[PDB]
């Protein structure tokens, strides 16, 4: 909104702002390793202590 005036100016009419904000993106990632000797025997079934 604005103020009306008594004295002379060229007054602004009803202003109205439209402002948009776009999103960001963040792509966080890391890397782990796993030995195949801990993956083959993981994918087997043992019967030995």
């Amino acid at each position: 909104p604005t103020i009306a005036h008594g004295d002379g100016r060229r007054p602004s009419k009803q202003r109205t702002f439209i402002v948009v904000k776009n999103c960001h993106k963040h792509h966080i990632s890391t890397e782990m390793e796993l030995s195949m000797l801990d993956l083959e025997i993981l994918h087997s079934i043992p019967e030995t202590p």
Binding site: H27, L34, M36, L39, E40, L42, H43
Partner: protein, 319 residues
Amino acid sequence: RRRLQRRIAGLLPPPARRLNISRGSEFTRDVRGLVEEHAQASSLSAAAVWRAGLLAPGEVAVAWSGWRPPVFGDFLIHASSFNNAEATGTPLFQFKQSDPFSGVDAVFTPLSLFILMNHGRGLTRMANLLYDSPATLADLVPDFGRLVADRRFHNFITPVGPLVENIKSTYLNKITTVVHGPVVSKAIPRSTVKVTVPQEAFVDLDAWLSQPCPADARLYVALTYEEAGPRFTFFQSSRGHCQIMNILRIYYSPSIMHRYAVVQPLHIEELTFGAVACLGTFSATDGWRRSAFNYRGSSLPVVEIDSFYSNVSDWEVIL
């Protein structure tokens, strides 16, 4: 010795080759078990990882199939030596820097590799729009003119194949390229990727000739040495490498005597008229659908080799 029977039970079953289906609308479990190829990316739960089966040795199996897992070479380049509006499917070229301990490599896409050729003498409009200053690229090679002048530029650049993922960093950009294997993206919606090469740089060699059609027609790169500045052209063909050298000699037959007429070969190293390298194979039927590539201002014509299989070779000299 009965446990060996259970071991051979766990080892026997190949992928299903035939399947006597009866109707189509029924959608039996057996035909689903034929057509279900396991995934590569899933949500993070141990039951979800177990159904996705990513812990299986080598190839994926729920507790070999003619399919190969792709490798992913990683590179580091300065942020100004690359434009983040490059397409996903574009081939890349490594230039070996001269420092012994480097860490940060130097990769050229053909759009960027164009302005290493034009400065010093449409498509060139876009190549000057994206990489605005040649001076930000003229220094990654330290001695370009001497290296063109003795014609040992081709054995310094090894192709690395197409691009996949560009994490748009601030200063030291990290890109991932497939040097070998099925070119497929690492995205959470795993979208298909099509290798693009700009149209004016890419002349077909099949319809350039204007019954035996195989399935794998290869894609060849070719650096050529011109006295008007060297050029990088690309080639699609369904022939053997023995055929590719002869038909490329017949294709470059004007340019060789063009260079012979303008510049006499005073030394013994100028006689190398560039080389070729197999960049890999793809589908010979659905090949090279055209497409368009927009930057913010303009649009160059561009081909799209779809579902590409990357396989780099060395350089074989054209002569």
